[PDB]
């Protein structure tokens, strides 16, 4: 399970709009800029002015799975993300690119945390580990040399879902699936206090500038304010009806703003029966961001499991959103048509589309035809499996593994590919050649060839190398060639790939033994041998044989353009009769 797979994603060069829900928000009041963090591995940037028609500024693309939390520092000179790909990445928030990557987490990295004063940050995740990093090193860190003083933090029983540091860089608290809230001192890694009181999962933590009292929201639906000074809960607060997953707080640290599976965005004050129902969002609320433009916080941005992000303004308080940042459709259903090179999807807008998996592109959109009846309008053939598909990013992420990547052999003919004769061809094999097309090692000439020879994958297509959870490396097909992106290949691409793409060493054929009988006979053949060629054998036991021999499995007559594995897969050791 520290064995390596090769993934890629099927997507337009630019995906302006979030093609799945949003897990985290950041706001730069200096530059009118908002950063969302997608459940599609993309941090996009936006301009908040009423001015902007489409606000969209840039896309920050380096993750492989759900980006889960983001944090701006040095005044948004530097952004830091964390994702389900185990990585905490570190960016340039101004230009819009990814400086370095931290792979020290062992599972989905869930929450991030920032103590502005001391400029220290913390990442935490489902691997139950908490890490500390001093920012000024991470901004000096690269893709070639990312070894740095990493402090670690210890205590947690179970998977952590939230994390928060006081403004001063003196207190840090985590909340996990143990209802308790473990607390530490950052500058020493030493433990401070347990904080028993909850009955469920705590997805949300906040602190006061001094970190003397703090808040917590939970999947029990309760907001609890704690006095760390007295290591005790001082008040519980059931405004919400379902688990609370999102919080924010005013500069005075007195009025709370919350939101959950409810969708209800209440806001209450410690002075707690004066609750202010702001709205009822159409989707569960993931996280929220306040505007600190001026105190009586004007408006609060709200991110959900829905692709579109709104801003709300300050029996319902508001009714319509004051802002709309639009969003993409999410593919939610899939189907692989059994030629095993084509796929039919269906997005949240009920748009059905037909794709080609091997060439890594869309064939067409089919408006909104009945999906499950469109899957029929269904060639009767069998090709072995070679890839798998996930929709975690709301996009087609395609995965190739050593175990069976090289299963699919088809005929150049039967793959569309021209042949002025007809050779045998391995699907995944051509593909790896075509994803690492621009990698100069792949440029071996056997007895200068670059590519596979039949097709190319779209140059913007991301190529990904993840352990069966950690993601080890990621580049776009075109950038396979840059020296910096190529010492990293020699470090990462696994032997099972090298063998085919670099050494051009082609793999096993699959033969099929079968019996033939009108005394039976023992034969064997390539599992993609045309039935025609078997009738050609019967005569001697070339077009003349179309007229004469008839082939028959399970007493059904055989189409003489069928390959053997189709037959055994459907009609049916395999046995065939003759006449």
């Amino acid at each position: 399970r520290r064995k390596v797979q090769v993934s890629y994603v099927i997507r337009d060069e630019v995906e302006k709009y979030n093609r799945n829900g949003v897990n985290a928000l950041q706001l730069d009041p200096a530059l009118n800029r908002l950063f969302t963090a997608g459940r599609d591995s993309i941090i996009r940037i936006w301009s908040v002015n009423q001015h902007k028609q489409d606000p969209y500024i840039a896309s920050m693309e380096h993750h492989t799975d759900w980006v889960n939390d983001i944090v701006l520092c040095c005044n948004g000179k530097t952004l830091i993300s964390a994702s389900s790909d185990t990585t905490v990445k570190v960016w340039n928030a101004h230009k819009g690119f990814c400086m370095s990557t931290l792979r020290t987490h062992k599972d989905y990295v869930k929450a991030l945390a920032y103590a502005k004063d001391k400029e220290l940050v913390a990442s935490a995740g489902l691997d139950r580990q908490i890490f500390l990093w001093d920012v000024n090193t991470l901004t000096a860190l690269t893709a070639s040399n990312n070894t740095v003083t990493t402090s670690s933090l210890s205590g947690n029983k179970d998977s952590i879902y939230s994390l928060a540091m006081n403004q001063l860089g003196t207190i840090i608290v985590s909340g996990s699936t143990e209802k308790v809230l473990r607390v530490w001192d950052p500058r020493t890694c030493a433990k401070l206090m347990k904080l028993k009181g909850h009955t469920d999962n705590v997805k949300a933590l906040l602190l006061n500038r001094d970190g003397t009292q703090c808040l917590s929201g939970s999947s029990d639906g309760t907001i609890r304010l704690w006095s760390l000074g007295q290591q005790r809960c001082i008040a519980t607060y059931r405004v919400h009806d379902e688990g609370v997953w999102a919080l924010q707080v005013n500069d005075a640290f007195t009025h709370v703003y919350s939101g959950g599976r409810d969708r209800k965005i209440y806001c209450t004050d410690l002075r707690p029966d004066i609750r202010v129902l702001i709205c009822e969002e159409k989707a569960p609320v993931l996280k929220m961001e306040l505007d600190r433009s001026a105190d009586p916080p004007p408006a609060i941005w709200v991110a959900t499991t829905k692709s579109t992000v709104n801003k709300w303004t300050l029996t319902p308080l508001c009714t319509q959103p004051d802002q709309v940042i639009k969003g993409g459709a999410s593919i939610i259903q899939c189907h692989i048509l059994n030629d095993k090179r084509h796929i039919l999807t269906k997005d949240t807008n009920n748009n059905v589309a037909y794709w080609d998996v091997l060439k890594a592109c869309k064939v067409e959109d089919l408006g909104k035809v009945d999906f499950e009846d469109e899957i029929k309008k269904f060639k009767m053939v069998y090709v072995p499996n070679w890839f798998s598909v996930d929709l975690k990013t709301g996009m087609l992420t395609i995965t190739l593994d050593e175990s069976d990547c090289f299963a699919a052999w088809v005929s150049a003919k039967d793959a569309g590919f021209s042949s002025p004769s007809d050779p045998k061809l391995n699907l995944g094999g051509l593909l790896l050649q075509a994803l690492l097309e621009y990698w100069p090692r792949t440029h071996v000439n056997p007895m200068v060839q670059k590519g596979n020879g039949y097709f190319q994958v779209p140059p913007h297509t991301p190529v990904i190398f993840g352990e069966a959870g950690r993601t080890l490396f990621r580049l776009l097909c075109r950038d396979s060639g840059g020296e910096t992106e190529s010492m990293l290949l020699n470090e990462t691409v696994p032997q099972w790939v090298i063998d085919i793409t670099v050494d051009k060493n082609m793999p096993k054929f699959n033969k099929i033994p079968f019996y033939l009988q009108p005394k039976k006979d023992r034969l064997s053949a390539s599992d993609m041998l045309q039935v025609r060629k078997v009738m050609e054998h019967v005569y001697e036991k070339a077009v003349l044989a179309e007229e004469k021999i008839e082939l028959l499995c399970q007493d059904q007559v055989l189409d003489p353009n069928m390959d053997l594995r189709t037959v055994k897969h459907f009609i049916w050791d395999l046995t065939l009769h003759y006449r």
Partner: protein
């Protein structure tokens, strides 16, 4: 009586505990009426109501079909049961089924995702039931949740991804003969003769299978059954009285597999 070929009581004790499952014994005698592991068991069963017996016919076939018994060492009766039962449950589905009618029920296992907190719910079947250590509660109600974490996260609908989650189970449909089985990785585990289960269908305890020792692959199995009660250990066949059950609830001896036939 059935001879011991050396640590082969894992079989002898399941076979005679299935032999006192009335519905199942009947359908099998009608199957030799009209050469796989099912013909071997029939050939066997066909010859016990006839007249101590060597089951060498059956053993020969079992361990040449499944290499998890083909050694001198012991085995685990529940592996065998589930093997034997499934391996009939399809040997018939080829040529729902008479086995399915008898032993099959279903359970609900509910899967609460932690990112959405969706209580997703789907069902699945069972021929037998494996549960861990009062019996009355384990069936009537639920399991106790067991998390899903490192390499065992759950695929969510809402999430369209694999995210952490909570599983637990509950019997959704009791079967005619409830094949029941208890953990090992021992106690004072209590179990009644009549059992009030979910229309309250309650069950007479008909057959059971016990284990001597302290680990389930080096000790010794035996059998207790419904007589028209009796105690069966490999060469011996002696009667026992219903109060000699509570003895089996260091090598503090427990039981293993309970069969509850319905009062139906």
């Amino acid at each position: 009586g059935l001879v011991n070929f050396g640590n082969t009581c894992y079989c002898n004790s399941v076979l005679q505990a299935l032999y006192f499952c009335r519905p199942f014994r009947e359908k099998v005698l009608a199957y030799k009426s009209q050469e796989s592991l099912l013909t071997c068991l029939a050939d066997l069963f066909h010859s016990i109501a006839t007249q101590v017996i060597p089951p060498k016919k059956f053993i020969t076939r079992l361990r040449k079909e499944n290499e998890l018994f083909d050694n001198y060492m012991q085995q685990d009766a529940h592996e065998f049961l589930n093997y034997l039962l499934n391996t009939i449950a399809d040997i018939l589905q080829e040529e729902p089924t008479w086995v399915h009618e008898i032993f099959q029920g279903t359970l609900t296992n509910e899967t609460r995702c932690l990112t959405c907190e969706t209580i997703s719910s789907k069902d699945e079947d069972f021929l037998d039931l494996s549960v861990d250590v009062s019996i009355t509660h384990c069936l009537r109600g639920f399991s106790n949740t067991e998390t899903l974490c490192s390499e065992y996260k759950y695929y969510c609908e809402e999430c369209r991804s694999k995210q952490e989650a909570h599983k637990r189970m509950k019997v959704k449909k009791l079967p005619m003969i409830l094949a029941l089985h208890l953990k090992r990785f021992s106690y004072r585990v209590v179990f009644p003769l009549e059992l009030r289960l979910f229309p309250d269908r309650m069950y007479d305890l008909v057959a059971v299978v016990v284990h001597c020792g302290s680990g389930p692959n080096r000790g010794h199995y035996i059998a207790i059954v419904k007589s028209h009660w009796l105690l069966f250990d490999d060469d011996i066949v002696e009667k026992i009285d219903a109060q000699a059950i509570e003895e089996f609830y260091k090598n503090s001896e427990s039981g293993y597999i309970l069969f509850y036939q319905s009062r139906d």
